[PDB]
Amino acid sequence: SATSTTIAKHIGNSNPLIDHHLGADPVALTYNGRVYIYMSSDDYEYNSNGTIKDNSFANLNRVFVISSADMVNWTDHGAIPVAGANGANGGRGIAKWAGASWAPSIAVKKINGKDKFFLYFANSGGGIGVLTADSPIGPWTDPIGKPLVTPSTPGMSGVVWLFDPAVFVDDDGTGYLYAGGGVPGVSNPTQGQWANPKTARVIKLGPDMTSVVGSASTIDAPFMFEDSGLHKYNGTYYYSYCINFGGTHPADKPPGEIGYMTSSSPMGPFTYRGHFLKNPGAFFGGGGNNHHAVFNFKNEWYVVYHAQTVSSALFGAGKGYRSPHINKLVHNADGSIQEVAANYAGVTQISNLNPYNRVEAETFAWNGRILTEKSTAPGGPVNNQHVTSIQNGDWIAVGNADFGAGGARSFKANVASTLGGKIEVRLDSADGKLVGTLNVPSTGGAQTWREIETAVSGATGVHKVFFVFTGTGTGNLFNFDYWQFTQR
Ligand SMILES: O[C@@H]1[C@@H](O)[C@H](O[C@@H]2CO[C@@H](O[C@@H]3CO[C@@H](O[C@@H]4CO[C@@H](O)[C@H](O)[C@H]4O)[C@H](O)[C@H]3O)[C@H](O)[C@H]2O)OC[C@H]1O
Ligand SMILES: [Ca+2]
Ligand code: NA
Numbered sequence: 392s393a394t395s396t397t398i399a400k401h402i403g404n405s406n407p408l409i410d411h412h413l414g415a416d417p418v419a420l421t422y423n424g425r426v427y428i429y430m431s432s433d434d435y436e437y438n439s440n441g442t443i444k445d446n447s448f449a450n451l452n453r454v455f456v457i458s459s460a461d462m463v464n465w466t467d468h469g470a471i472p473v474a475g476a477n478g479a480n481g482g483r484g485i486a487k488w489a490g491a492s493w494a495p496s497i498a499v500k501k502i503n504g505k506d507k508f509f510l511y512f513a514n515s516g517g518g519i520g521v522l523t524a525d526s527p528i529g530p531w532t533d534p535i536g537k538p539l540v541t542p543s544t545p546g547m548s549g550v551v552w553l554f555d556p557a558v559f560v561d562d563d564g565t566g567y568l569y570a571g572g573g574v575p576g577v578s579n580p581t582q583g584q585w586a587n588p589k590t591a592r593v594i595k596l597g598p599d600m601t602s603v604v605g606s607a608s609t610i611d612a613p614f615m616f617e618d619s620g621l622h623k624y625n626g627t628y629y630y631s632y633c634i635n636f637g638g639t640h641p642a643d644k645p646p647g648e649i650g651y652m653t654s655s656s657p658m659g660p661f662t663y664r665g666h667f668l669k670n671p672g673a674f675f676g677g678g679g680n681n682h683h684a685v686f687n688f689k690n691e692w693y694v695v696y697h698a699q700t701v702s703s704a705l706f707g708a709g710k711g712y713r714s715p716h717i718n719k720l721v722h723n724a725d726g727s728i729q730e731v732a733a734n735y736a737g738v739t740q741i742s743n744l745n746p747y748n749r750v751e752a753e754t755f756a757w758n759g760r761i762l763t764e765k766s767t768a769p770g771g772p773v774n775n776q777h778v779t780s781i782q783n784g785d786w787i788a789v790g791n792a793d794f795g796a797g798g799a800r801s802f803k804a805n806v807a808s809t810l811g812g813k814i815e816v817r818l819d820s821a822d823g824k825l826v827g828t829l830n831v832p833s834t835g836g837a838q839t840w841r842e843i844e845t846a847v848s849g850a851t852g853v854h855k856v857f858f859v860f861t862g863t864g865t866g867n868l869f870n871f872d873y874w875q876f877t878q879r
């Protein structure tokens with residue numbers, strides 16, 4: 392009954408994090424037991440004849456957000472319509488001054504006893520903006536109505552590409568913004584311009600995280616290119632960035648790789664240490680921009696980065712379209728960082744999923760091959776999505792659902808369907824033990840939602856769980872908002 396194949400994130404593998412769409416320039420928020428990943432909205436551009444053309448970043452006007460409690464099952468929180476200029480996101484789009492929202496950065500700060508969230512983004516190469524929210528997934532407000540940082544921000548002149556923000560809230564509650572990149576000398580930098588672009592910047596933020604304090608300092612990242620990052624390990628601040636591709640490079644600053652520098656203060660002085668992530672081309676073939684954030688989630692150090700692993704699998708060429716990956720990052724006893732072993736296997740699931748809570752359908756580890764959108768389902772979480780583009784033989788799967796010793800009694804699915812179909816609930820594999828079959832009736836339409844219940848038996852212990860979609864003809868069989876098992 393399950394016939395569709397995984398594009399790039401194969402069952403058992405944790406990279407790329409998702410493959411049912413793209414997501415470039417990832418950054419991580421760790422918050423109340425979940426990692427959020429916020430991403431540039433990579434999205435295929437097409438020639439007029441419907442063939443794919445190389446990514447020119449034309450579609451980078453949203454921020455894609457996924458989250459996980461376990462590194463394997465990703466809840467799709469959909470898209471934040473950040474860019475509102477030109478104009479389009481069809482209306483919708485939150486920062487009216489910004490035509491683009493590249494390379495997000497995310498921070499949370501408790502203000503007046505309430506957690507407040509701050510999403511930073513680059514309006515292409517021209518400035519940094521910020522949105523605010525009372526939850527990591529929104530809804531979002533543009534407090535300011537203009538960029539937060541421009542070339543006129545003190546200290547920011549001399550930056551070639553005023554982009555790739557990284558916002559770090561220090562242990563004392565002070566925010567810092569790292570930004571910049573590009574290489575001076577336009578079409579022909581001299582060797583020395585390659586070697587010391589002097590286009591990286593850090594600026595301190597005001598307490599409210601929507602203003603700057605003082606002037607930006609230059610970080611002299613050798614062979615700076617883009618992709619500022621900041622993490623703090625054992626009291627030391629690590630400024631990381633992508634090394635440029637031009638000029639001759641010494642062996643210790645290899646082109647297109649992630650370099651890093653350390654300092655005992657967030658604003659420097661920084662000393663190059665420092666490379667830990669080869670170009671994604673070195674691992675997955677070969678190659679492109681390289682774009683990364685280091686974070687600690689549930690007591691482990693990771694780097695999120697991107698690679699052209701979904702587009703290459705679909706097209707035979709990555710064409711600049713990028714997908715998020717995570718691997719472990721290891722700090723040595725001396726504080727240096729080991730080369731990250733970027734791969735497909737990725738990170739092993741760190742905790743089980745509880746299938747007795749409401750679980751969004753768009754919370755899955757693997758799929759073949761569906762889409763997620765914006766749902767009309769009543770209620771649900773902020774920016775509630777559903778699984779759609781469900782055809783016969785499609786499926787989604789969660790990793791390590793723990794049904795417990797007693798096991799499940801029933802399975803509920805919130806579904807909307809014009810003609811109906813089935814959800815087969817299978818353990819371990821797409822062709823695995825059938826524990827139940829939910830008959831999706833005609834509900835009256837794709838926006839008319841019914842919670843359907845069906846019996847489950849044989850579902851005990853920890854398993855991958857596959858929801859295999861079947862139906863006749865069509866089209867879209869149904870959309871698929873959330874599910875919940877009952878005990879026992
Ligand atoms: O409008 C401005 C944009 O144009 C500017 O876009 C940047 C263009 O450069 C992007 O970096 C690319 C990454 O790929 C490099 O080539 C690789 C060299 O090794 C080969 O193995 C591999 O196949 C190649 O892909 C290329 O040299 C380098 O320029 C950068 O990420 C973009 O940001 O952005 C700012 C806008 O203001
Ligand atoms: Ca949902
Ligand atoms: Na970033």
Ligand code: NA
Nearest residue numbers: 760761780782
């Ligand atoms: Na499909």
